[PDB]
Amino acid sequence: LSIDEYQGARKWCFTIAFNKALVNRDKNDGLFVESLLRHEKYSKHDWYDEDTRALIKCSTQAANAKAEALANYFSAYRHSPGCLTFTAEDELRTIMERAYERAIFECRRRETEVIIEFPSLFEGDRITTAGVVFFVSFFVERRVLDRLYGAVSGLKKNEGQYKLTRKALSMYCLKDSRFTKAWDKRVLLFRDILAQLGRIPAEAYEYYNPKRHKDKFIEFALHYLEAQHSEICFGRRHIVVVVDFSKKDEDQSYYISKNNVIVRIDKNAGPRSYRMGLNELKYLVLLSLQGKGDDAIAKLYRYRQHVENILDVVKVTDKDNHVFLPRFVLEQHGIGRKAFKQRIDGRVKHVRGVWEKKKAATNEMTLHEKARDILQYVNENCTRSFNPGEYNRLLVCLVGKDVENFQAGLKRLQLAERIDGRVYSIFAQTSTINEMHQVVCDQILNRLCRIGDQKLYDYVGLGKKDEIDYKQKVAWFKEHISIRRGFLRKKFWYDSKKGFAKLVEEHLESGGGQRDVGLDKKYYHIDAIGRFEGANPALYETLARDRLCLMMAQYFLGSVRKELGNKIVWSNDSIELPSIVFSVSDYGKLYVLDDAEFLGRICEYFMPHEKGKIRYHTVYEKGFRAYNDLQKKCVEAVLAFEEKVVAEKTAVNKVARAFFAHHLKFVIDEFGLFSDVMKKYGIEKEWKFPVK
RNA sequence: GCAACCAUUCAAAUAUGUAUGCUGGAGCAGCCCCCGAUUUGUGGGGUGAUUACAGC
RNA sequence: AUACAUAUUUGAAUGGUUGC
């Protein structure tokens, strides 16, 4: 239990962790401070007070020296216990206590209740097992620390306590992934695109893998366009809905509202910002994939100049330029005005149509849809409109089937003279949401079917009181320009008779990928119904956007194709590299390719008879797991050797060093000699090595 | 042929926090209808607005 | 009830280990 109780061969789990800390300190000497500050870069709120931050900044040499001392202590049979003492004074102790209390707070505040206590890092001026685990965490990948904690925890009886304690102790540990300089998001996007493409389009699923539920084209397109074009940045959303262009938070969601995004293009003399729809986005992706991205972005950048030129000469400009201008501009210059009579007719027809459809659909409509309709009726009949609180309260009643409380609400509005007795009364004969909804539809349609009076024009929103100056509207418009639908199409494919889908198909066939979707083509067309009927248009468009997404995936894989000197065979359901076959999805969030020598030796030494393609699962079970098992035995053996004693020597040192550092830099013959010397000195183990 | 343990992915259920209204402007954008059409069209209409909008 | 985030439980698919 206490750290003092780990003597001789029992030290092994700590030997492995601390040697890895040194392995990693030799790759990067800055890891203590890097790890301590990792999370605080993402926090407005200080993780540390000012003096703590100061101590952290000075601590590299101290922490690196302590790392070496403990590695020495844990790698020897007998070492002086002095290194296990941290005084109250100790810089490292203060740092550790602050970092730990911070981690606990971070854990607890995300839980619904406080269930457990956390282990102390210190007892008097002596580090505990938990303290030693915490110290090493700063230097090692999550998998190393989990392996250590798994060996030394007294807490595994209670799964919940074990995992929460582990969460705190492992707060500051490195990501498993060697390649990740926190820009390996292309790996995750690759997997996400493949996962989405493998889901069957909803409409095809219902007719004939999981079902696709969400269209993620825009999300993928934004990640791809930002990766390809450093001049471009899309609006991110936060709720205080605020749109900003900060790339400080990677997790932060893109602003996507009704298939619109906000783009900022930084060219020439400074950034220009536009709203861009799905239509323009998908053409931009298509153009980017074919190497015309820079040119497309140049044309979008210049778009505002054209608008500004047209704005001065609306009356005289070519009618073709009217497309770039909102109604209010054209109407100001006497273009496309409609008689109030015509505006009334269109408005009333629409609102009538909306309410006839609601009336027909009551039984099929959601409680939210029905509640909104009922509230829209009450609100429009109120002297003073609902405040947010009043609205919320009544909505909660309707959604919760609390018709009694809703009717008590109407009574209160009546007693307050906000609604008249008629409005209260029309609901008195109803007991259900559906009945109330029908009554409301009837009252509204009665109002809309009247011979056109002054009250009607106001009711349907044609009655303006407040006058905004045209010149204010123009100014607003100029800072809120949206790209005309079909803009990029007209700039690049003016005289093209090929639709979007055919342009995508032509690029796919001739572009050099030689890929297509891995879903059966039947999932993109219902053979039994006409080309243009039902879901067939939407599925055909989906085939084109999926093909774009496949090409985006092919671009992303390209980045990790650039990294290292290993070939890729990429299938729908596997990646093969020189061979190891990663299954499930792509890898199943795996790595291992970063140490090619080690993977080579793992395969050579633990799987000598296997040739050609080997499953990752097999490499793990027969290789990495087998290595880990052997490593425990060799470290335990080496420590027991030291205890007892306190070409053969060469081999012993090399094999020892290999197992201490988690590599295979020795030959089979050399393990023979190591094994011989262990046998000669009393310490046997069931080596299970070398392999048949 | 079956069970247990570990790892990975998907679906479903439960709890907690936050949001949901009004007025004016905005329909270049998004969406829908009609008209064509191996399908998403710088073809015609709409859309009491869904809002990088201003206030209460 | 809808949207978003966090946490917990169950089932299904895949591989390995153990027992008969």
mmCIF file with all atom_site columns, C-alpha atoms in Angstrom, chain A residues 8-10 77 633-646 678 681-685:
data_model
loop_
_atom_site.group_PDB
_atom_site.id
_atom_site.type_symbol
_atom_site.label_atom_id
_atom_site.label_alt_id
_atom_site.label_comp_id
_atom_site.label_asym_id
_atom_site.label_entity_id
_atom_site.label_seq_id
_atom_site.pdbx_PDB_ins_code
_atom_site.Cartn_x
_atom_site.Cartn_y
_atom_site.Cartn_z
_atom_site.occupancy
_atom_site.B_iso_or_equiv
_atom_site.pdbx_formal_charge
_atom_site.auth_seq_id
_atom_site.auth_comp_id
_atom_site.auth_asym_id
_atom_site.auth_atom_id
_atom_site.pdbx_PDB_model_num
ATOM 1  C CA . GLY A 1 8   ? 12.900 -5.478  -5.366  1.00 0.00 ? 8   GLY A CA 1
ATOM 2  C CA . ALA A 1 9   ? 10.718 -7.002  -8.137  1.00 0.00 ? 9   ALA A CA 1
ATOM 3  C CA . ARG A 1 10  ? 7.507  -5.242  -6.849  1.00 0.00 ? 10  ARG A CA 1
ATOM 4  C CA . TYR A 1 77  ? 17.049 -2.938  -5.895  1.00 0.00 ? 77  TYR A CA 1
ATOM 5  C CA . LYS A 1 633 ? 8.771  -10.673 -16.321 1.00 0.00 ? 633 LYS A CA 1
ATOM 6  C CA . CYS A 1 634 ? 12.128 -9.256  -17.520 1.00 0.00 ? 634 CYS A CA 1
ATOM 7  C CA . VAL A 1 635 ? 11.893 -6.163  -15.263 1.00 0.00 ? 635 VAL A CA 1
ATOM 8  C CA . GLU A 1 636 ? 10.874 -8.286  -12.214 1.00 0.00 ? 636 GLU A CA 1
ATOM 9  C CA . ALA A 1 637 ? 13.729 -10.714 -13.154 1.00 0.00 ? 637 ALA A CA 1
ATOM 10 C CA . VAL A 1 638 ? 16.342 -7.900  -13.467 1.00 0.00 ? 638 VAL A CA 1
ATOM 11 C CA . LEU A 1 639 ? 15.352 -6.464  -10.041 1.00 0.00 ? 639 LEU A CA 1
ATOM 12 C CA . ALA A 1 640 ? 15.396 -9.929  -8.335  1.00 0.00 ? 640 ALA A CA 1
ATOM 13 C CA . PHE A 1 641 ? 18.877 -10.417 -9.963  1.00 0.00 ? 641 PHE A CA 1
ATOM 14 C CA . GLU A 1 642 ? 20.210 -7.155  -8.432  1.00 0.00 ? 642 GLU A CA 1
ATOM 15 C CA . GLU A 1 643 ? 18.768 -8.202  -4.999  1.00 0.00 ? 643 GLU A CA 1
ATOM 16 C CA . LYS A 1 644 ? 20.411 -11.707 -5.102  1.00 0.00 ? 644 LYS A CA 1
ATOM 17 C CA . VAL A 1 645 ? 23.807 -10.379 -6.351  1.00 0.00 ? 645 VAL A CA 1
ATOM 18 C CA . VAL A 1 646 ? 23.879 -7.414  -3.906  1.00 0.00 ? 646 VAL A CA 1
ATOM 19 C CA . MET A 1 678 ? 18.725 -15.448 -15.095 1.00 0.00 ? 678 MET A CA 1
ATOM 20 C CA . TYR A 1 681 ? 21.280 -17.025 -10.730 1.00 0.00 ? 681 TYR A CA 1
ATOM 21 C CA . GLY A 1 682 ? 18.067 -18.707 -9.506  1.00 0.00 ? 682 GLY A CA 1
ATOM 22 C CA . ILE A 1 683 ? 15.488 -16.291 -11.032 1.00 0.00 ? 683 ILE A CA 1
ATOM 23 C CA . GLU A 1 684 ? 13.508 -18.205 -13.652 1.00 0.00 ? 684 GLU A CA 1
ATOM 24 C CA . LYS A 1 685 ? 10.333 -16.902 -15.378 1.00 0.00 ? 685 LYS A CA 1
#
